[PDB]
């Protein structure tokens, strides 16, 4: 009735990134959504602080190169891992769901790595 020899789950890997993706997002995401989502387009910032010129200067620099990558990549892995389980939680049947969601993740991860090395 219960299998004596079960297959080791591959889950720890996806869960591993999920943990870091969840932590980064809990710590840094609020302030980021504030800047990019609200402050920038409403123009509520002192002088030339979030002008094309200044944002690029940070973007091109090595610190901001690493930062932008992590701020994008990590939260995706968290978010997508969750949606994969929401499907199963809603009794919705998605074929190759595993590969579909993490497939998406890997694609964008590559797109971003490509982006942060400049095009």
């Amino acid at each position: 009735m219960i299998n004596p020899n079960p297959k080791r789950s591959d889950e720890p890997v996806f869960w591993g990134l999920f943990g870091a993706g969840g932590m980064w997002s809990a710590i840094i995401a609020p302030v980021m959504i504030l800047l990019v989502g609200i402050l920038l387009p409403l123009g509520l910032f002192p002088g030339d602080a979030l002008s094309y010129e200044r944002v690029l200067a940070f973007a091109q620099s090595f610190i901001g190169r690493v930062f932008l990558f992590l701020m994008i990549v990590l939260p995706l892995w968290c978010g997508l891992h969750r949606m994969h389980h929401a499907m199963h939680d809603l009794k919705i049947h998605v074929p190759a769901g595993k590969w579909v969601f993490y497939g998406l993740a890997a694609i964008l991860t590559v797109v971003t790595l490509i982006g942060v090395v400049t095009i």
């Binding site: 009735m1 219960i2 080791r8 789950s9 389980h85």
Partner: protein, 243 residues
Amino acid sequence: AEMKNLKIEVVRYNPEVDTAPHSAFYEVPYDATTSLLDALGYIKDNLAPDLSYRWSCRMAICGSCGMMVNNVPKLACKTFLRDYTDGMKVEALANFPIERDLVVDMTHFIESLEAIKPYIIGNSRTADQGTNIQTPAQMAKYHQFSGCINCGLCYAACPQFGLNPEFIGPAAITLAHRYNEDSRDHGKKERMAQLNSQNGVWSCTFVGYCSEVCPKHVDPAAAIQQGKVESSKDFLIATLKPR
């Protein structure tokens, strides 16, 4: 002398007669101290001798008392009619097959509990050498998880086990974690295989409602998380394992 009355809804099922469970209503006298278990007894003696249920201790220590009360997992043993003044509906324990009335098939539980090998492994000490040495500190490592009474309440509460019957379950993982973390136990590798399985710890999505319904405050959800961290550690070591 006059005692106040209450109309209780009980969901009845007879394999001999009934196709599906159907409801039956009973007028039962109550006071400030009347437990659901008391009320069930009253019905059996007077209103219906054909009612069946499980119970023994009368004091929330045995655990055979599990059932649903207005869609909530509770022990009849410790449920009080004073609280459900507006109305009360009693179903058999959820996520489990109904054998009869309020009596359920709890094979999977026992079997899951069996699978994890919940006993001391590979400690060669013998009686005539005195006890092991274990510090109050070393004990506080596993103590809380050792207090589980196999009520089943957490399995009824867990949505994941509802969706998947094969999943070994909270109570079972908790007990496995109990021995894993015991300073006297050298059988950590023996029960990891089960925990590492998809039906192991990796079916919990940390809903946490099992910890919410535990009458004995085990907090099994924490045992699972620690179990996931331990499983991850094992997975890592096992990746570098080609020796």
